[PDB]
Amino acid sequence: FTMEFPFDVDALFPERITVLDQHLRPPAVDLQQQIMTIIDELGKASAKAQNLSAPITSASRMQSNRHVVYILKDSSARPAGKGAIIGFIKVGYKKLFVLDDREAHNEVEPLCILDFYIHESVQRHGHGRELFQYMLQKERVEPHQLAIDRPSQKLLKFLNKHYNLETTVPQVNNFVIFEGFFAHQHPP
Protein backbone atom coordinates (compact mmCIF):
# COMPACT_ATOMS: atom_id res chain seq x y z
CA PHE A 1 0.00 0.00 0.00
CA THR A 2 1.52 3.28 -1.20
CA MET A 3 -1.63 5.41 -1.00
CA GLU A 4 -1.90 5.53 -4.80
CA PHE A 5 -3.78 3.25 -7.19
CA PRO A 6 -3.86 2.74 -10.96
CA PHE A 7 -7.26 4.37 -11.13
CA ASP A 8 -8.74 7.74 -10.17
CA VAL A 9 -9.57 7.82 -6.46
CA ASP A 10 -11.11 11.28 -6.66
CA ALA A 11 -13.61 10.11 -9.27
CA LEU A 12 -14.41 7.03 -7.17
CA PHE A 13 -14.70 8.89 -3.85
CA PRO A 14 -15.98 12.47 -4.34
CA GLU A 15 -16.23 13.15 -0.60
CA ARG A 16 -13.25 13.64 1.73
CA ILE A 17 -14.43 10.77 3.97
CA THR A 18 -16.42 7.94 2.41
CA VAL A 19 -18.49 5.59 4.57
CA LEU A 20 -19.03 2.02 3.38
CA ASP A 21 -20.84 -1.02 4.77
CA GLN A 22 -21.12 -4.71 3.80
CA HIS A 23 -22.63 -3.82 0.41
CA LEU A 24 -19.60 -1.76 -0.60
CA ARG A 25 -21.73 0.56 -2.74
CA PRO A 26 -19.78 2.89 -5.02
CA PRO A 27 -20.77 6.54 -4.48
CA ALA A 28 -23.06 7.71 -7.30
CA VAL A 29 -14.66 -0.18 -15.15
CA ASP A 30 -15.96 -2.04 -12.09
CA LEU A 31 -16.03 0.67 -9.44
CA GLN A 32 -16.93 -1.86 -6.77
CA GLN A 33 -13.75 -3.81 -7.42
CA GLN A 34 -11.78 -0.58 -7.10
CA ILE A 35 -13.30 -0.16 -3.62
CA MET A 36 -12.58 -3.80 -2.78
CA THR A 37 -8.96 -3.42 -3.82
CA ILE A 38 -8.55 -0.29 -1.67
CA ILE A 39 -9.96 -2.12 1.36
CA ASP A 40 -7.77 -5.18 0.74
CA GLU A 41 -4.61 -3.06 0.53
CA LEU A 42 -5.54 -0.93 3.54
CA GLY A 43 -6.17 -4.05 5.62
CA LYS A 44 -2.83 -5.59 4.70
CA ALA A 45 -1.00 -2.35 5.53
CA SER A 46 -2.76 -2.01 8.90
CA ALA A 47 -1.91 -5.58 9.84
CA LYS A 48 1.76 -5.00 9.07
CA ALA A 49 1.75 -1.79 11.13
CA GLN A 50 0.33 -3.63 14.16
CA ASN A 51 2.55 -6.70 13.97
CA LEU A 52 -0.31 -8.98 12.92
CA SER A 53 0.41 -12.06 10.80
CA ALA A 54 -2.72 -11.60 8.66
CA PRO A 55 -5.27 -8.86 7.87
CA ILE A 56 -8.41 -8.34 9.98
CA THR A 57 -9.86 -5.97 7.38
CA SER A 58 -10.54 -7.04 3.81
CA ALA A 59 -13.22 -6.73 1.17
CA SER A 60 -14.46 -10.27 1.81
CA ARG A 61 -14.56 -9.67 5.57
CA MET A 62 -16.56 -6.46 5.00
CA GLN A 63 -19.06 -8.40 2.92
CA SER A 64 -19.57 -11.09 5.56
CA ASN A 65 -19.87 -8.88 8.66
CA ARG A 66 -21.81 -5.88 9.95
CA HIS A 67 -18.91 -3.47 10.09
CA VAL A 68 -18.67 0.07 8.76
CA VAL A 69 -15.53 1.53 7.26
CA TYR A 70 -14.67 5.24 6.97
CA ILE A 71 -12.05 5.96 4.34
CA LEU A 72 -10.12 9.23 4.23
CA LYS A 73 -8.81 10.30 0.83
CA ASP A 74 -5.97 12.79 0.34
CA SER A 75 -7.38 16.31 -0.16
CA SER A 76 -4.12 17.56 -1.65
CA ALA A 77 -3.09 17.23 -5.27
CA ARG A 78 -0.66 14.39 -5.98
CA PRO A 79 1.91 14.49 -8.80
CA ALA A 80 0.52 11.36 -10.50
CA GLY A 81 -2.82 13.16 -10.60
CA LYS A 82 -5.17 10.30 -9.71
CA GLY A 83 -5.71 11.03 -6.01
CA ALA A 84 -4.66 8.90 -3.06
CA ILE A 85 -5.96 7.22 0.08
CA ILE A 86 -4.66 8.25 3.52
CA GLY A 87 -6.26 5.68 5.81
CA PHE A 88 -9.38 4.34 7.47
CA ILE A 89 -11.22 3.44 10.62
CA LYS A 90 -13.51 0.39 10.90
CA VAL A 91 -16.20 0.11 13.54
CA GLY A 92 -18.94 -2.32 14.48
CA TYR A 93 -21.30 -3.05 17.34
CA LYS A 94 -20.52 -6.17 19.36
CA LYS A 95 -22.15 -7.97 22.26
CA LEU A 96 -19.67 -8.19 25.13
CA PHE A 97 -19.69 -9.07 28.81
CA VAL A 98 -17.51 -6.70 30.78
CA LEU A 99 -16.38 -6.66 34.37
CA ASP A 100 -16.73 -3.43 36.33
CA ASP A 101 -15.00 -2.33 39.53
CA ARG A 102 -17.98 -3.51 41.60
CA GLU A 103 -17.51 -7.18 40.69
CA ALA A 104 -20.45 -7.16 38.27
CA HIS A 105 -20.40 -8.66 34.81
CA ASN A 106 -22.35 -6.30 32.57
CA GLU A 107 -23.91 -7.34 29.27
CA VAL A 108 -23.28 -4.53 26.81
CA GLU A 109 -23.38 -3.83 23.08
CA PRO A 110 -21.12 -0.86 22.50
CA LEU A 111 -19.78 0.50 19.25
CA CYS A 112 -16.30 -0.97 18.94
CA ILE A 113 -13.23 0.36 17.15
CA LEU A 114 -12.05 -2.68 15.20
CA ASP A 115 -9.23 -1.42 12.94
CA PHE A 116 -7.67 2.04 12.44
CA TYR A 117 -4.69 2.95 10.24
CA ILE A 118 -3.12 6.04 8.70
CA HIS A 119 -0.31 5.58 6.15
CA GLU A 120 3.09 5.69 7.89
CA SER A 121 4.39 8.60 5.82
CA VAL A 122 1.58 10.86 7.02
CA GLN A 123 1.07 9.76 10.63
CA ARG A 124 1.15 12.48 13.26
CA HIS A 125 -0.23 15.01 10.79
CA GLY A 126 -3.69 15.10 12.35
CA HIS A 127 -5.41 12.73 9.91
CA GLY A 128 -6.28 10.16 12.58
CA ARG A 129 -8.02 12.77 14.71
CA GLU A 130 -9.99 14.06 11.72
CA LEU A 131 -11.19 10.57 10.82
CA PHE A 132 -12.03 9.70 14.45
CA GLN A 133 -14.06 12.92 14.84
CA TYR A 134 -16.07 12.27 11.67
CA MET A 135 -16.85 8.75 12.86
CA LEU A 136 -17.95 9.99 16.33
CA GLN A 137 -20.35 12.48 14.74
CA LYS A 138 -21.91 10.03 12.28
CA GLU A 139 -22.19 7.21 14.83
CA ARG A 140 -23.51 9.66 17.50
CA VAL A 141 -21.23 8.28 20.17
CA GLU A 142 -18.88 9.85 22.68
CA PRO A 143 -15.32 8.50 23.04
CA HIS A 144 -15.82 7.06 26.56
CA GLN A 145 -18.74 4.95 25.28
CA LEU A 146 -16.46 2.94 22.97
CA ALA A 147 -14.78 -0.40 23.33
CA ILE A 148 -11.61 -1.11 21.34
CA ASP A 149 -10.36 -4.46 20.07
CA ARG A 150 -6.80 -4.91 21.43
CA PRO A 151 -5.69 -1.28 21.06
CA SER A 152 -2.11 -0.46 20.27
CA GLN A 153 -0.22 1.70 22.74
CA LYS A 154 -0.09 4.39 20.01
CA LEU A 155 -3.85 4.48 19.98
CA LEU A 156 -4.05 4.68 23.77
CA LYS A 157 -1.69 7.70 23.69
CA PHE A 158 -3.81 9.25 20.90
CA LEU A 159 -6.97 8.80 22.92
CA ASN A 160 -5.44 10.23 26.06
CA LYS A 161 -4.02 13.20 24.19
CA HIS A 162 -7.13 14.13 22.21
CA TYR A 163 -9.96 12.99 24.50
CA ASN A 164 -8.33 12.56 27.94
CA LEU A 165 -9.42 8.92 27.96
CA GLU A 166 -8.04 6.68 30.69
CA THR A 167 -8.43 2.93 30.62
CA THR A 168 -10.72 1.38 33.25
CA VAL A 169 -11.08 -2.20 34.51
CA PRO A 170 -9.09 -4.73 32.42
CA GLN A 171 -11.06 -7.43 30.63
CA VAL A 172 -10.48 -11.05 29.65
CA ASN A 173 -12.10 -10.65 26.21
CA ASN A 174 -9.34 -8.66 24.46
CA PHE A 175 -11.36 -5.42 24.48
CA VAL A 176 -10.40 -2.24 26.26
CA ILE A 177 -12.81 0.25 27.80
CA PHE A 178 -12.27 3.66 29.41
CA GLU A 179 -13.38 5.47 32.56
CA GLY A 180 -16.90 6.68 31.91
CA PHE A 181 -17.99 3.49 30.14
CA PHE A 182 -20.06 2.32 33.12
CA ALA A 183 -23.16 4.15 34.33
CA HIS A 184 -21.62 4.91 37.74
CA GLN A 185 -18.49 6.45 36.19
CA HIS A 186 -17.81 9.91 34.77
CA PRO A 187 -15.94 10.78 31.59
CA PRO A 188 -12.90 13.08 31.41
Binding site: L114, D149, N173
Partner: peptide, 4 residues
Protein backbone atom coordinates in the same frame (compact mmCIF):
# COMPACT_ATOMS: atom_id res chain seq x y z
CA UNK B 1 -12.13 -10.04 19.08
CA UNK B 2 -10.72 -10.46 15.56
CA UNK B 3 -7.18 -9.76 16.77
CA UNK B 4 -7.02 -12.93 18.74
Amino acid sequence: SDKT
